[PDB]
Amino acid sequence: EVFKGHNLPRLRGAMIGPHVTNADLLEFGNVWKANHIRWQLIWNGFPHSPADSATLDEYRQWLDGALKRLEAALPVCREAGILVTVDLHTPPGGRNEASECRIFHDREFQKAFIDIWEDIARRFADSDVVWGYDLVNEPVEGMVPDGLMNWQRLAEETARRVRAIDQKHAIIIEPAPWGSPSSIALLDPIDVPGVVYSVHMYVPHAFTHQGVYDNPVGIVYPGTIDGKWYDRNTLRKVLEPVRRFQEENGVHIYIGEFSAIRWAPADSACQYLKDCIEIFEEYGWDWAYHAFREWDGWSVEHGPDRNDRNRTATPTDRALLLRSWYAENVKPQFS
C-alpha cells in the first residue's frame, strides 16, 4: 500500500540528454531493456544556465521548445517500453552565483514556478507514458525573504496545484539543499496524495567527480577518501537518513541520479555503481543512472582515459552491470 505511481516491480533506467534521438530511445528500451528515463528540461547546463540572467518571457520561450520535444518523444518511449520522469532541471530565473534558486528569492519567479507546473500538469495529465513530475532538480534555498515560500512550503503548494489538475501521476519531491541524502532529514512529508521522494547519490564527490571542477584524479574506491574509509558499508551509512525517511513515513524512494566518473582508477567507478545499485535494490528504490548519451564523463560507452572522447570498441564493465540489472525489468503495458 506504499504509493509508487506505477504497477511494475521496479523502474531501472537512466537520465537522458536533451538531444537524445528517437533511435537512441528505441535502442535503450528495446535492446538495453531499460524501462525508465528521467527527461531533463535543462537550459544548456547545470547549475549555471542562461536562465540565470534571462527574463521570464525568454525562459517561457525556451521551456516551450523543450516541452515540445518531450511531448514528441512520449510516443517513442511508449514503443520503447519506457516510463518517463519529467524533471524541471532549470527553473524560472535559474540560480544566483552561489547556485541558489531564484524561485526562493523573487516573487515573479516563485509565482511562475507554480504557474508553469500547472501548465505542464495540464499538458501531460492524460499521458500513460509519463510516470511522475520531479518538481525541481536539486533545489537550493539560501536566504528566503519574508513574504516568500521556502522549499517545504513551495513544494507543498505546487504539489497541491499539480494534484488538482492530475489525478494519476506521481509528484516527485527532492529535499533542499541539493537533493542530497543528508537533506532528506530536513524535509517534512507533504500532505498531498501520490508523492514519491527522491535523492541523488554522488557521495563522496571527491571520488564521483574526480577530475571534474577543481577535484584531483587518482581516487580509488573502495579506499580512504576525505580521511574516511569508503566501501559499501560507508554508502549504506550515507543513505541511512533516506532509509529512515522511507520506513518512518511509509513512502516510496526514487534515486533520480547517481554516477561515478568514467576515468576513476581501475574498476572503482564500476564498484561504486554496483554497490549503489545493490543498496537501492535491497530497499526497493526505483533508480535512474546518470546518464545515457549525455556528457561523456558519465557515459558507460566511453573508457578509462579522460583525454579519449571516443566510444569504446567493446562493452565496459559499467555497461554490462547496467544491462544485467535492466534485464530484471518488467516492461510497462500500454493500451
Residue 58, classed as helix, strand or coil, is helix
C-alpha distance from residue 309 to each of 24, 208, 303, 313 (Å): 19, 19, 8, 12
Q: For the purposes of burial, counting CB atoms within 10 Å of the CB of 27, is it exposed (0-12), middle (13-18) or buried (19 or more)?
A: middle
Domain ranges of the chain: 12-327
- The closest of 305, 300, 294 to 319, measured between CA atoms, is 300
Q: Decide: 254 and 246 in contact? Cβ < 8 Å.
A: no
Which resolution in angstroms does this entry have? 1.2
47 Cβ contact partners less than 8 Å away, ≥ 6 residues apart:
95, 99, 138
288 Cβ contact partners less than 8 Å away, ≥ 6 residues apart:
11, 13, 14, 15, 36, 37, 38, 85, 254, 255, 256, 257, 258
Give 17-23's long-range contacts (Cβ < 8 A, gap of 24+): 17/291, 17/292, 17/293, 17/294, 17/295, 18/42, 18/66, 18/69, 20/73, 20/292, 20/293, 22/73, 22/76
Q: Decide: 2 and 251 in contact? Cβ < 8 Å.
A: yes
The Cα–Cα gap between 137 and 87 comes to: 7
99 Cβ contact partners less than 8 Å away, ≥ 6 residues apart:
47, 48, 140
C-alpha distance from residue 158 to each of 117, 136, 260 (Å): 7, 11, 32
Q: For the purposes of burial, counting CB atoms within 10 Å of the CB of 189, is it exposed (0-12), middle (13-18) or buried (19 or more)?
A: middle
Peptide bond into 315 cis (omega under 30): no
- Residue with cell string 516541452: 67
- The closest of 102, 122, 124 to 111, measured between CA atoms, is 102
Backbone angles phi, psi at 255, to 5 degrees: -95, 105
The Cα–Cα gap between 30 and 51 comes to: 35
The Cα–Cα gap between 163 and 73 comes to: 24
> Looking at domain 12-327, does it have CATH number 3.40.50.300?
no
Q: Side-chain half-sphere of 85: how many Cα atoms within 13 Å?
A: 34
Maximal C-alpha separation, the chain: 57
Q: What is the CA radius of gyration of the chain?
A: 19
The Cα–Cα gap between 35 and 238 comes to: 27
- The closest of 3, 1, 5 to 170, measured between CA atoms, is 5
- The closest of 225, 222, 224 to 205, measured between CA atoms, is 225
Helices (H), the chain: 22-30, 56-80, 107-124, 151-165, 205-208, 232-249, 268-283, 317-326
The Cα–Cα gap between 74 and 127 comes to: 8
- The closest of 162, 172, 159 to 131, measured between CA atoms, is 172
The Cα–Cα gap between 163 and 114 comes to: 12
Q: Decide: 222 and 265 in contact? Cβ < 8 Å.
A: no
The Cα–Cα gap between 133 and 9 comes to: 20
Using CA of residue 169, residue 161, residue 14, residue 3, what is the dihedral sign? negative
Q: For the purposes of burial, counting CB atoms within 10 Å of the CB of 183, is it exposed (0-12), middle (13-18) or buried (19 or more)?
A: buried
Backbone angles phi, psi at 94, to 5 degrees: 60, -140
| Identity of the amino acid at 153 | R
Q: Decide: 163 and 151 in contact? Cβ < 8 Å.
A: no
Length of the chain as a residue count: 335
Using CA of residue 147, residue 99, residue 84, residue 175, what is the dihedral sign? negative
Q: Decide: 153 and 192 in contact? Cβ < 8 Å.
A: no
Residue 87, classed as helix, strand or coil, is strand
The Cα–Cα gap between 268 and 13 comes to: 21
Q: Decide: 65 and 43 in contact? Cβ < 8 Å.
A: no
Q: Decide: 5 and 170 in contact? Cβ < 8 Å.
A: yes
